[PDB]
Amino acid sequence: AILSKKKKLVADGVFYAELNEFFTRELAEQGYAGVEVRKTPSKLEVIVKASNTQGVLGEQGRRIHELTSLIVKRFKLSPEGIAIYAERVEERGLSAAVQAEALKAKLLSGLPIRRAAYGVLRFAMGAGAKGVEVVISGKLRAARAKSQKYADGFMIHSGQPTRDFIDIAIRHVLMRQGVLGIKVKIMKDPAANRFGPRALPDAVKIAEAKDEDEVIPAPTVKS
Amino acid sequence: QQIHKIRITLTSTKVKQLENVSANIIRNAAQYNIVKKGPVRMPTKVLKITTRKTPNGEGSKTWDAYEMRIHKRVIDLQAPASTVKRITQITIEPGVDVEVTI
Amino acid sequence: GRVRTKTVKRASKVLIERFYPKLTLDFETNKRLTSEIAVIQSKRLRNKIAGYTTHLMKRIQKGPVRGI
Amino acid sequence: GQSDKRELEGEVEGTEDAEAELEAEAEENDESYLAELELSKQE
Amino acid sequence: MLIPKEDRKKIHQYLFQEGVVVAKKDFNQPKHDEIDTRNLFVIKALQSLTSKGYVKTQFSWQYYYYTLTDEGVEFLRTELNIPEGILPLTRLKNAPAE
RNA sequence: GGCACCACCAGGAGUGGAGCCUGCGGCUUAAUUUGACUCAACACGGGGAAACUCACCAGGUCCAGACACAAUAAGGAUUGACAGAUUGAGAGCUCUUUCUUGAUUUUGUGGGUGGUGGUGCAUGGCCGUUCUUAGUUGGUGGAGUGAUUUGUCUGCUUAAUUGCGAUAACGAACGAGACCUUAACCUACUAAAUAGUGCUGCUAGCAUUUGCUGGUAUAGUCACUUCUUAGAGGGACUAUCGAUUUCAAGUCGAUGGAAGUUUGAGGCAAUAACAGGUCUGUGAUGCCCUUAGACGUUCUGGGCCGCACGCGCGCUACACUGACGGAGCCAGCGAGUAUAAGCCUUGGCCGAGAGGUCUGGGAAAUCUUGUGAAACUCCGUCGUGCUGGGGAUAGAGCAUUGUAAUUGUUGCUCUUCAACGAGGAAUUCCUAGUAAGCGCAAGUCAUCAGCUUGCGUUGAUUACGUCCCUGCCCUUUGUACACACCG
Ligand SMILES: [Mg+2]
Ligand SMILES: [Mg+2]
Ligand SMILES: [Mg+2]
Ligand SMILES: [Mg+2]
Ligand SMILES: [Mg+2]
Ligand SMILES: [Mg+2]
Ligand SMILES: [Mg+2]
Ligand SMILES: [Mg+2]
Ligand SMILES: [Mg+2]
Ligand SMILES: [Mg+2]
Ligand SMILES: [Mg+2]
Ligand SMILES: [Mg+2]
Ligand SMILES: [Mg+2]
Ligand SMILES: [Mg+2]
Ligand SMILES: [Mg+2]
Ligand SMILES: [Mg+2]
Ligand SMILES: [Mg+2]
Ligand SMILES: [Mg+2]
Ligand SMILES: [Mg+2]
Ligand SMILES: [Mg+2]
Ligand SMILES: [Mg+2]
Ligand SMILES: [Mg+2]
Ligand SMILES: [Mg+2]
Ligand SMILES: [Mg+2]
Ligand SMILES: [Mg+2]
Ligand SMILES: [Mg+2]
Ligand SMILES: [Mg+2]
Ligand SMILES: [Mg+2]
Ligand SMILES: [Mg+2]
Ligand SMILES: [Mg+2]
Ligand SMILES: [Mg+2]
Ligand SMILES: [Mg+2]
Ligand SMILES: [Mg+2]
Ligand SMILES: [Mg+2]
Ligand SMILES: [Mg+2]
């Protein structure tokens, strides 16, 4: 009903947080990356970014139709008040969420870790990432647990720029002997950034010398 | 029910889109000869929550300090009600919500 | 202390080797010049780079400097 | 991958996995009666 | 679980025609606000259906997300003795958008 | 060799000595659930537990045991039940009692499922710690057969592997720094009836000089943005000038300045690691245990508070730089609701108080709210006295919250008025709006803040130095260690 300004913006955020996890659990197998809630008059546009937009929009769009119905019945929304669109992620290699979900689907198929880990190192860089580092922790046949880091290229660690040019995704992998924890850190190239800064804070680009012309003593060029 | 003194209240978490919508409405209220009052910068509200870092209760007593800035702006327009509402759809933005009160 | 770092020390001496004739011994004039010569991401690094370039310019007139 | 082998293989077999997927994925993108009525027809 | 045949019925004509059902996880709730029966009945009635491969169940933030399988439409086709006109509503081929 | 108020020097406030609050051990217990034990366990698990929470104890219910079978089963597989007994109970729990419902369902098999049950020494994630110390790495070149090494260093300097410089190295990367948030400046822009002001209408009091204090003002359909708010910018870069220095990095003084300690303060924070802590945050988890007389869940009552004792974080105080009694009277950070399940609550009226009642405002720069807070200041009483310091312990009474206050939730009134007369050995924190007082708000929260997280009022003494103690880092060195001295 009547809800305060402080309590309304938080509710929109809380709604987003709960809605986002719902897609992660339901659309985990389709490389779910993220969701964008575009509020508009007379409609609630929701844009989901996934590696595979066929599993959501399958068999005459039955799943996406049967999936928007699960949201009208839980948030007491009018059947016409919400519309869900499925959009393909443009650069699948630059999304750590897609890369972490892809790694889990390989580890659960029994593929070796080394072959699986290098499959995301090269896929991230091939998409144009400035750097990438993958950490996989857990237990594998051995009673003792271990973690292994797989770095590549250039990575920044401290300060604000990690919030601007780095996206991260952690998932738990359910194995027959325990839980495997994977961390996929991908740093995008700042030159391709279209909303924030387009370079690192300490990058200084000096222009070139425009000099080395020939000076003539003192004429006047009229027009 | 014609020309009225009409208030549009703008609230959002991020200021860039808030000022774009605010300036775009002001821009459209300039070429259209509509007298306007605003935008009025309301004192921003800092919603702060301070939790413990430890999920357990072991270690040094370290705390997080999260923040959620809420910026509120109100703009007063002197125009008929049909004109002001269509201005809102011209300057519709996902982040900023709009409420209109007479 | 006020020890300048390497991101400001090396970037300032590249300016002298490249734009010495247009530089000067005044910080205010140097500060405006480096905003059109270099792409500096932050204003604070602008007034630092120019503040050390001015010191080097003030030092070049007294004799030869190392690194330029 | 605790050996000099299977880790060589991790790299190579791993990289051919991506090279096959960048080209495949870059190709994937370049070429881009009701029911309630039956509950009311009891007249 | 002991559900009256009549109350179980309303649970079946809600899981068909809007073939998805959402139920908050509280067992003592008097009314699930969309099936005029006990909320616990809805959870346990559909726990059997997902137990016999007729609905997928998803759980997130203390909420149940029930969706009807294509195999489950056939089950309600015969057991409910309903006309063979299928396609509840989420299967009505409303088609997506591009 | 070097750095450091989690080290010291000069000092300040102390703690340890008293009473009490609270946590830990112990003792006790029907149970007094449990984790953590140097820093980095002990006002910590946001853990301020009447019920719930709850995991403990003494008892009582339910299946919320899906599903394939097999058995039983309409001549009824089973579920609910008045009355009496039973029970703590108006639990059909069970027992006499015959009624009701109708294949949902009862028994066995498998299979489940649920566990604040065990294992944090099987794990994920998170967090703490080494350590926010300043450290780490590769390309080419040099040395070595190699693992490796140099680069990554004598010296000076810095908060800093940060810089100068020396240089078989040269040129770089992460970390540092940059970055981000916040506080301090802008009479220079942009506006503001949810901010303020001068004028102006209308209007009050005091001396009449035209002055001085106000109220009113959402139509005065005024003027302005200095104070208030916040967006776009500007502004500090050690700027200029003196000293020292390898005349280098720098450092110390002045002048200007809002700001010259990284301008003050924080957020983030590298390469690896710990059997560090949590499965008592998770519908995060592998395995083990249990799964109908449950270790699931629920109901009732008790316990987590229990008291010969040892220890830690603190609060009141030991008086006169003070207690009371009147009077003066100034902040900032914040929070706030609807057919609820009841929010912040002014203003009026009762009441010594605590508190009660009637209206109204506020989903909020609008109202609570200028939160008229406390220390503080003035004037009085007291007069070195276990005194009017101090307010435990206890008796009697009055209200609030809550189903429920007994083992007093808390508040108020009268009475009792205890140790304590500045604290041994030891030991903690701290360098400027800082320490110390002093309160206020938010979190927990129906009630309860001696607790934390912040905020502001008043506001210092003493260094601006060192390796003497202590801890850590680096270099050299020894090694029979490499699961790395817990060897
Ligand atoms: Mg950096
Ligand atoms: Mg930093
Ligand atoms: Mg001392
Ligand atoms: Mg004291
Ligand atoms: Mg506490
Ligand atoms: Mg209890
Ligand atoms: Mg109990
Ligand atoms: Mg107990
Ligand atoms: Mg239990
Ligand atoms: Mg551990
Ligand atoms: Mg661990
Ligand atoms: Mg080399
Ligand atoms: Mg070499
Ligand atoms: Mg370095
Ligand atoms: Mg760096
Ligand atoms: Mg007004
Ligand atoms: Mg007046
Ligand atoms: Mg700082
Ligand atoms: Mg241990
Ligand atoms: Mg558990
Ligand atoms: Mg659990
Ligand atoms: Mg919890
Ligand atoms: Mg039991
Ligand atoms: Mg306790
Ligand atoms: Mg007791
Ligand atoms: Mg403490
Ligand atoms: Mg007094
Ligand atoms: Mg106010
Ligand atoms: Mg006395
Ligand atoms: Mg007393
Ligand atoms: Mg001392
Ligand atoms: Mg000490
Ligand atoms: Mg209590
Ligand atoms: Mg409180
Ligand atoms: Mg050795």
From Swiss-Prot, chain D:
UniProt feature coiled coil, ranges: 5-43
Location of the protein in the cell: Cytoplasm
Acidic residues composition-biased segments: 10-31
Post-translational modification summary for this protein: Phosphorylation by TORC1 upon nutrient replenishment inhibits STM1 and causes its release from dormant ribosomes.
Domain of life: Eukaryota
Physiological role: Ribosome preservation factor that protect a small pool of nontranslating, vacant ribosomes in cells under nutrient starvation conditions. Under nutrient-limiting conditions, cells reduce ribosome biogenesis and degrade ribosomes via autophagy (ribophagy) or proteasomal degradation. To avoid excessive degradation during starvation, STM1 binds to and protects 80S ribosomes from proteasomal degradation. Under nutrient-sufficient conditions, TORC1 phosphorylates and inhibits STM1 to prevent formation of dormant 80S ribosomes.
Family: Belongs to the STM1 family.
Known partners and oligomeric status: Associates with mature 80S ribosomes. Binds to the head domain of the 40S ribosomal subunit and prevents mRNA binding by inserting its alpha-helix domain towards the mRNA entry tunnel at the decoding site, where it blocks the binding of tRNA and mRNA at the A- and P-sites. Interacts with eEF2; interaction sequesters eEF2 at the A-site of the ribosome, thereby blocking the interaction sites of the mRNA-tRNA complex, promoting ribosome stabilization and hibernation.
Stated name of the protein: Ribosome-associated protein STM1
Gene: STM1
